[PDB]
Amino acid sequence: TLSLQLPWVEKYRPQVLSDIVGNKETIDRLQQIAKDGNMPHMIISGMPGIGKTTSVHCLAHELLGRSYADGVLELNASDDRGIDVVRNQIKHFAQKKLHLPPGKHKIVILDEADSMTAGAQQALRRTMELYSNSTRFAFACNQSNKIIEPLQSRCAILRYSKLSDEDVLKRLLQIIKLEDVKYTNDGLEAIIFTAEGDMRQAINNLQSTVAGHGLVNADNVFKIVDSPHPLIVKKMLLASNLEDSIQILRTDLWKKGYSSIDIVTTSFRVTKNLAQVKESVRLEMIKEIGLTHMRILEGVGTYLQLASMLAKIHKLNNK
Amino acid sequence: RSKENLPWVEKYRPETLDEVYGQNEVITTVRKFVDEGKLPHLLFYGPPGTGKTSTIVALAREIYGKNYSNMVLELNASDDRGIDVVRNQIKDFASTRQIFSKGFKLIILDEADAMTNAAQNALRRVIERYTKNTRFCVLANYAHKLTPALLSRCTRFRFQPLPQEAIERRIANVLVHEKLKLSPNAEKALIELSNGDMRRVLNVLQSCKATLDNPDEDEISDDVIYECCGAPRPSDLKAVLKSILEDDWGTAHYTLNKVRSAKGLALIDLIEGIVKILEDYELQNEETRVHLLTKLADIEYSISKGGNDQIQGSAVIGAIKASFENET
Amino acid sequence: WVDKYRPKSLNALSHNEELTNFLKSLSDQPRDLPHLLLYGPNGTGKKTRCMALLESIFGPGVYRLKIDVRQFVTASNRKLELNVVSSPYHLEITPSDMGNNDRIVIQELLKEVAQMEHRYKCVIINEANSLTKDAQAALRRTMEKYSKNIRLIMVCDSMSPIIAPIKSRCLLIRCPAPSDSEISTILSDVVTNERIQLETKDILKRIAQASNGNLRVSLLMLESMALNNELALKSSSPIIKPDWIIVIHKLTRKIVKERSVNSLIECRAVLYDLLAHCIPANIILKELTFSLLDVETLNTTNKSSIIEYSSVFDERLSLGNKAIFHLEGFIAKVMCCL
Amino acid sequence: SFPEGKPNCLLGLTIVFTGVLPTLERGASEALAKRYGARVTKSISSKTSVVVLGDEAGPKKLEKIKQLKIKAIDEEGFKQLIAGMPAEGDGEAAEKARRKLEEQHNIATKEAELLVKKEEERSKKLAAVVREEDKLWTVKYAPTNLQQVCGNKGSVMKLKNWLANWENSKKNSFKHAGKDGSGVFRAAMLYGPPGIGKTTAAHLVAQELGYDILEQNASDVRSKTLLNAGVKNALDNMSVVGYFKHNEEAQNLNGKHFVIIMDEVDGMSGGDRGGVGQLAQFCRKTSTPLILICNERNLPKMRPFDRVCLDIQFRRPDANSIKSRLMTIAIREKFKLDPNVIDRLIQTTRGDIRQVINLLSTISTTTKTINHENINEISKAWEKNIALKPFDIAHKMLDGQIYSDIGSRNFTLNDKIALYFDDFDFTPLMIQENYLSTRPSVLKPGQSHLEAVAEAANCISLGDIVEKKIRSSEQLWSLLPLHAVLSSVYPASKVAGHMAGRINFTAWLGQNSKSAKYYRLLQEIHYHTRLGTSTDKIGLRLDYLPTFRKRLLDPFLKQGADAISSVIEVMDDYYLTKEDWDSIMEFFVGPDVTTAIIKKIPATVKSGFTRKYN
DNA sequence: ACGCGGCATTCAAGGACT
DNA sequence: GATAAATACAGACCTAAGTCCTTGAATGCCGCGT
DNA sequence: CTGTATTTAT
Ligand SMILES: Nc1ncnc2c1ncn2[C@@H]1O[C@H](COP(=O)(O)OP(=O)(O)OP(O)(O)=S)[C@@H](O)[C@H]1O
Ligand SMILES: Nc1ncnc2c1ncn2[C@@H]1O[C@H](COP(=O)(O)OP(=O)(O)OP(O)(O)=S)[C@@H](O)[C@H]1O
Ligand SMILES: Nc1ncnc2c1ncn2[C@@H]1O[C@H](COP(=O)(O)OP(=O)(O)O)[C@@H](O)[C@H]1O
Ligand SMILES: Nc1ncnc2c1ncn2[C@@H]1O[C@H](COP(=O)(O)OP(=O)(O)O)[C@@H](O)[C@H]1O
Ligand SMILES: [Mg+2]
Ligand SMILES: [Mg+2]
Ligand SMILES: [Mg+2]
């Protein structure tokens, strides 16, 4: 078909701050700031798909009213991460004179701010303070650690958290009711489980299920969206017997098409994040997994090395 | 040329979405997506030779027609993975219209797992901003290399390794296109050595056709497949394993040496086959499996680093014998 | 001096007559000579035999050596300089002086001299073990493609670092170390020519046995004890051991006596002091292990564990840039064994 | 759990929470003690009123308690003491705490009233351009005079004295240091944690003394060309603004001159082409005061600046000084603030006044009363995640509590890996240098210290192998977490415990540089003697050098100054020079060291040798 | 025709890589 | 005024490696004015 | 940790 329909993530992107479901304290604080005015400098950080860009965009829209065209400067940090940007474009926008409602000021939105280079970030330090009376900067990034500490000092540290299953279920139910989709409770629960708090993943998976099969049922959602790799990897690592681990590997990972490097990397990540196993045993399994990773990266990527790694882990656990 | 002077791997590349087999779920899901028009951002991640590139090229043909090479920005991410690419080419293509016909824009990124992290961090906003008139497809053999942000904005489809039936159907189509015949045992051996990759199947079929003295009238037997591929026959594998298991060291060494020398089989393939056979075994105690797997893994790694073939073979014999000696 | 008396021709060689006959057999028809790789114990006389073969093939002017400087550029803009000893008929490359950039020196200089051209020029790679695997991989095709213009002769001590294709492409010439009797004869000739008074001749055999087959070390020790006894060797003349030997011996005594972490303080201190003064770590491990084995107090189990851990940490050293990171581990493991 | 108590019951009591408490972790106990006005210190002292330890107390710390005769109570004792103690701490110390709180509140009210009067005067002047509520709390409460800066009073006084006596030192040509000593340095550097008030202090000292402020952001202007032109023509030029700004009155003679306060000096480009090294040559030849400000003074790029600037270390101000300022800005803004949570706010923010003010502004929009009920959530969401310095990484990684069963839940393995990743170039070296200088406390039953050290060293060997694989032509950077584990975490977990002595810096760096220098010298010597000696680089040092000493140095030891000719002949036989001789004489170790031997040689012999060689 | 004047392009140094 | 509490803070920074990225300096060609 | 520096307290 020549034309396409808009995705549900962008078509149903919240246009007001109330539609945002998660992080109730932060959303209420941003709504109070929007009503009262005098927006402070901030960095918004968290996981992908929990509503950081949407929150800042709704805040800017509501704060600036009809003046969003001029008062808002949109600059994807990854696209424009040079000191030249700060020297010319950001500085000229900050020195720009614009008549606004009393409380409100001009807003700079720098999405994906974690990718800004050191030079541009350091140059922004004085632009943040010199033109603060007229210009207010806003930062959105996946990881706040990439942003230098002095820049974090000048702004409010507003930190987001992974979306709870209840809020994702509420948003999914709202979209389902609005667009008349047939669903089952098991299917919605499975979509929430696969999303793992990423609302964007949940909505994309709902779109895929609806378009492909037409009914939101557990069977369809599992065929169209596979079970999360770390869970099968953890089940393989935490099996009681060696033969069980070998069987889980052969069936779920090797025969299904997962690569050796992916398997070993996910095993390392799961092992480092495991909590039931004591730290010493966890560390020695990490050692064995790292040896297997070294062999795979040197070029020996085979079922034999993965089985040997499982055998070493089981020997380590069996004392 | 006339597409007749090309290797069978490229000669038999699928041209329409109906010539891609094995990935039926992905094929029907994508066909229904394009038919109804809600085509999301696609992520085809799977093992090599599963048809991801062929699937997406057939998608481009079915979406835009015969003139698909000019209305689609197909970029080899391995060749050009810089952030300059995202800033200039990808962004200008997404922003602008089509020079040929009205319609949406599709950008295919092949081997995007080689893209630098800066490039993906730049793309994670280009994809979102231009989603109204542009769609992105990501193909990558490995999903760990790709940034998590790039895995959140694209719908994920997993290309399973090609099963038996799809490989049989493609083998039959290739056999019909040429003037060739395949024995059922030879086809079974080819399927087993394929490991789910049609690339290997086509390469081995072409090599066996070359091996045939007069391909017009003779048949490719299992012997031809094993000889041209170089893989060890199952009979040799069973004989070697039996000789190691329950025979004297001198006889076991003699058997392994004569099996390797007579057919030119490599030792590493023998180890892989022996691992495959002994895995199917039912073992009384756990320790023997652990010892066997560990010692054979170190032997295979040392072979990968090279060394003395006879010493490594004797090490294989000793490891197997000790492991099954633990079963008493 | 060692340099004072060095054979300058094949016919002047006096030890391992089989090797001399093999070299003359190669020199008989020199237009058909494979690439060579001289290997054997250090100090045997492998370089002397290689240069004698060169003198046999070419004229007697191969010993007129001249040092030249050939600046090279690495992948980065850094400037690297090499001293290339050269002769009218041959040139010598010792890539151990450079670090990981020996590959560049190989591929540029050898290809250049190949383009430059008794139709072949022999290149002597004195240090072949320090050649990185990448450098040998680059040299793998240089030997075969330019076999009509350049014929490499390689000097080596242990063939294990050298990769299999390089050994395959080149003829192997074994060099047995001189026997004690031949070392004693050479020392007798030296002391006769140098006018060193000998009270008896058992001194020469003692020096020969204290060199472990090394002739360079034998002559150096001869002259060293010739300076502490006023050019007159006596029966009770002490054997001069180099400084690093004494330091390593004291290290073994400390490891044998104090098996504590507080002793590990000074053990690491001595290892750092030895490493900072141009002493390789593999030599440290070898001498330390063999001196530890010579301790009479330790029983067989300790000796076996020591040699096992020595092999393990030797592998670790061979696969590790930071040497003390493995040397300290070996010493601590030996202390735990004891 | 804990029974409620009437407000400020534990006021005036010094409580140290030494023992690990099963019911509540350290931070929870500290918070529930500070809720009632108690003072928490990290060190047990004579002034410590009560030490709370249920069990698992430090042995040496227990002996300290025993010697200082400090009363000790358990968790149930803390429960009963909460109810037992009366309100407001009565006690003489409690009365002192009462008085301190009353004076702090009184000053808060006085400054609030002063600010209201200032606002009223501004309103009257306007009646007779940015509205005040539009401004952020950081800039609207910025210090207007040097008496409002919180903390670092000594640094402010020293900087003020330096800038005041700058003219006198200029008349003395800067050769004389003066009484304070800040009269020999032309430029001054202010460095410290961000947000403590260096820029404000510099601006205020410039304003008070009457100089004309010229501010340049070094991060914005870092190249040689722009900085060179601008600041050079700024160094020796008067101010047209200063001349036209009412030069007629003679109160301020310094109105003409410039004070160039270069902010963000830490962001200048590095290298010789970079301007950070150019400014070092630049600041010594200037005719106007220079006030450089940077955040990380101990940086490799800032090395040219130690000997050319007056270092001034601004420290993190203590919460007591900022208590009055926070109370004033809380009284003015009609939001309730309890001084008990101010210390926790500063600790969470890590002494950053700007960020604590921003937190107060942002939180107060929704919640009008910041109390002990929501302090935990405020702290957990606003905590600074600052990368630990390579010394604190060594301290924390080499800690017994971190790898304990209880400590593992609090500090997880991923936290340990991130602690490595804070500095991925020095942590493996620091652990290797200080893993065998700690008293272990996680030794397995039947394992001695030496066995743990051997296992740790084996792990560091594997980590070095992994590092070589990562940092070679293959560039396998995906193995970096494996290197983190193998190099830092496992070896430290094997030998985890208490630090016996001090955390030393990695000695591998200096010895490696020394090895490189000695290898260069040996290369030069070997290439000089190449014609004579058929050897390699290593073999020369191994064998010839001992004999070369006997043929060069020993003749000077025994024959005397008459052996000079033979020594010269020996050097000329292998093309050696005096530098070569000196380098060989520095190559011996152990018994054969020549550092003292050459000194004992008569100076006449060495002088004659030098003259004869020349 | 002949000489500067910005502006595009090429070169070189520093930092980072989970 | 000296000596204790009470605490913030500094101890130090390397050489290679491959490839991408950025920033400033040095370089080139091409348009306008006289 | 040890050693040095600064501010409030005795
Ligand atoms: N499902 C399939 N049906 C038919 N032919 C196939 C199929 N998969 C692979 N082939 C054959 O194998 C060739 C290679 O296919 P590609 O799609 O290029 O491989 P791939 O799945 O993209 O894996 P790569 O290239 O390593 S990422 C095609 O040209 C076909 O000849
Ligand atoms: N000691 C202090 N007392 C009172 N207010 C302060 C203090 N330090 C900082 N502030 C406030 O913080 C604002 C900014 O102070 P700055 O001097 O710019 O911080 P900084 O120390 O220079 O750190 P930077 O700017 O990140 S390098 C001032 O305008 C004050 O409102
Ligand atoms: N809390 C939320 N409530 C409702 N929708 C959400 C929420 N978080 C994410 N979404 C949906 O996800 C889509 C994109 O999310 P986005 O805000 O871009 O993620 P990120 O915060 O990582 O940038 C939006 O269209 C929005 O509909
Ligand atoms: N056949 C020989 N007869 C006499 N001296 C010899 C002989 N071979 C070697 N040498 C002595 O060995 C010294 C050089 O040893 P060298 O060749 O450098 O050892 P390496 O084998 O380690 O290169 C010479 O000075 C020479 O006197
Ligand atoms: Mg976003
Ligand atoms: Mg492909
Ligand atoms: Mg500042």
PDB file of C-alpha atoms and ligand atoms in Angstrom, chain A residues 126 129 154, chain D residues 198-199 263-264 293 295 354, ligand 7:
ATOM      1  CA  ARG A 126      28.537  29.549  31.224  1.00  0.00           C
ATOM      2  CA  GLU A 129      24.096  30.787  33.863  1.00  0.00           C
ATOM      3  CA  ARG A 154      23.163  23.841  37.751  1.00  0.00           C
TER       4      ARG A 154
ATOM      5  CA  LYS D 198      34.648  30.365  43.792  1.00  0.00           C
ATOM      6  CA  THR D 199      33.212  32.530  41.001  1.00  0.00           C
ATOM      7  CA  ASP D 263      36.174  30.841  34.548  1.00  0.00           C
ATOM      8  CA  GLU D 264      36.199  27.159  33.559  1.00  0.00           C
ATOM      9  CA  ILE D 293      39.068  29.114  38.413  1.00  0.00           C
ATOM     10  CA  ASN D 295      37.165  22.348  39.145  1.00  0.00           C
ATOM     11  CA  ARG D 354      23.716  25.587  44.132  1.00  0.00           C
TER      12      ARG D 354
HETATM   13 MG    MG H   7      32.214  28.850  38.451  1.00  0.00          MG
END
